[PDB]
């Protein structure tokens, strides 16, 4: 079972 | 700004979650997802409620909220 993956996306 | 968490579901049912501000263009999310899948960004299409997400769409424009789902499919014939 895959682990949780959270990616923070930055602005411009 | 403040962030919401979106869940991106792939064709194999896998998930990657993204925290994004309400004003951030969703191009950046598409790039990150494609990078992590190891495929060209133009080989994928990203849908919210079945509608195509453009590079310059924001969560605010699309009415997105905390824990909303984006689905990713292969690109299709035509435009």
Short mmCIF file of C-alpha atoms in Angstrom, two decimals:
data_model
loop_
_atom_site.label_atom_id
_atom_site.label_comp_id
_atom_site.label_asym_id
_atom_site.label_seq_id
_atom_site.Cartn_x
_atom_site.Cartn_y
_atom_site.Cartn_z
CA UNK A 1 0.00 0.00 0.00
CA UNK A 2 1.34 3.37 -1.10
CA UNK A 3 2.22 6.01 1.47
CA UNK A 4 0.65 9.46 1.58
CA UNK A 5 2.27 11.97 -0.80
CA UNK A 6 1.68 15.72 -0.36
CA UNK A 7 3.54 18.24 -2.59
CA UNK A 8 3.49 21.97 -1.86
CA UNK A 9 3.23 24.05 -5.02
CA UNK A 10 4.72 27.57 -4.91
CA UNK A 11 3.35 30.73 -6.58
CA UNK A 12 5.04 32.79 -9.53
CA UNK B 1 -2.72 33.56 0.57
CA UNK B 2 -3.98 30.28 1.98
CA UNK B 3 -3.76 26.79 0.62
CA UNK B 4 -6.13 24.00 -0.22
CA UNK B 5 -5.23 20.34 -0.65
CA UNK B 6 -6.23 18.74 -3.98
CA UNK B 7 -6.11 14.99 -4.73
CA UNK B 8 -4.85 13.97 -8.19
CA UNK B 9 -6.07 10.48 -9.17
CA UNK B 10 -4.24 8.64 -11.94
CA UNK B 11 -5.47 6.07 -14.43
CA UNK B 12 -4.14 3.33 -12.12
CA UNK B 13 -5.96 4.72 -9.14
CA UNK B 14 -2.78 6.04 -7.55
CA UNK B 15 -2.95 9.44 -5.78
CA UNK B 16 -0.64 12.43 -5.33
CA UNK B 17 -1.93 15.30 -3.17
CA UNK B 18 -0.98 18.97 -3.78
CA UNK B 19 -1.23 22.03 -1.53
CA UNK B 20 -1.87 25.09 -3.70
CA UNK B 21 -2.98 28.65 -3.06
CA UNK B 22 -6.36 29.81 -4.40
CA UNK B 23 -4.58 32.21 -6.81
CA UNK B 24 -1.84 29.92 -8.17
CA UNK B 25 -2.02 28.94 -11.84
CA UNK B 26 -2.54 25.20 -12.12
CA UNK B 27 0.19 24.81 -14.78
CA UNK B 28 2.59 24.34 -11.87
CA UNK B 29 0.61 21.40 -10.47
CA UNK B 30 0.48 19.79 -13.91
CA UNK B 31 4.26 20.12 -14.35
CA UNK B 32 4.97 18.58 -10.95
CA UNK B 33 2.61 15.65 -11.52
CA UNK B 34 4.02 14.86 -14.95
CA UNK B 35 7.56 15.14 -13.60
CA UNK B 36 6.76 12.60 -10.84
CA UNK B 37 5.13 10.22 -13.35
CA UNK B 38 8.15 10.49 -15.68
CA UNK B 39 6.05 11.42 -18.73
CA UNK B 40 5.79 14.50 -20.95
CA UNK B 41 3.29 17.02 -19.65
CA UNK B 42 1.62 17.19 -23.10
CA UNK B 43 0.82 13.46 -22.97
CA UNK B 44 -1.66 14.09 -20.12
CA UNK B 45 -4.97 15.90 -19.67
CA UNK B 46 -6.15 17.09 -16.24
CA UNK B 47 -9.90 17.23 -15.50
CA UNK B 48 -11.97 18.84 -12.73
CA UNK B 49 -15.60 17.60 -12.73
CA UNK B 50 -14.77 16.25 -16.16
CA UNK B 51 -13.76 19.66 -17.57
CA UNK B 52 -10.29 20.40 -18.89
CA UNK B 53 -8.00 22.37 -16.57
CA UNK B 54 -6.07 25.06 -18.45
CA UNK B 55 -2.57 26.20 -17.56
CA UNK B 56 -3.87 29.61 -16.41
CA UNK B 57 -6.86 28.33 -14.42
CA UNK B 58 -6.70 28.86 -10.67
CA UNK B 59 -8.56 27.00 -7.89
CA UNK B 60 -10.56 30.20 -7.26
CA UNK B 61 -11.64 30.45 -10.90
CA UNK B 62 -12.77 26.80 -10.95
CA UNK B 63 -14.55 26.92 -7.58
CA UNK B 64 -12.24 24.32 -6.03
CA UNK B 65 -12.29 23.55 -2.31
CA UNK B 66 -10.37 21.53 0.28
CA UNK B 67 -9.98 17.86 -0.72
CA UNK B 68 -11.45 18.27 -4.23
CA UNK B 69 -10.40 15.66 -6.82
CA UNK B 70 -8.58 16.15 -10.13
CA UNK B 71 -8.50 13.20 -12.55
CA UNK B 72 -5.60 12.63 -14.99
CA UNK B 73 -6.13 10.87 -18.35
CA UNK B 74 -4.01 10.39 -21.49
CA UNK B 75 -4.37 13.10 -24.11
CA UNK B 76 -6.95 12.47 -26.89
CA UNK B 77 -7.25 12.81 -30.68
CA UNK B 78 -8.15 16.32 -31.85
CA UNK B 79 -7.80 19.68 -30.06
#
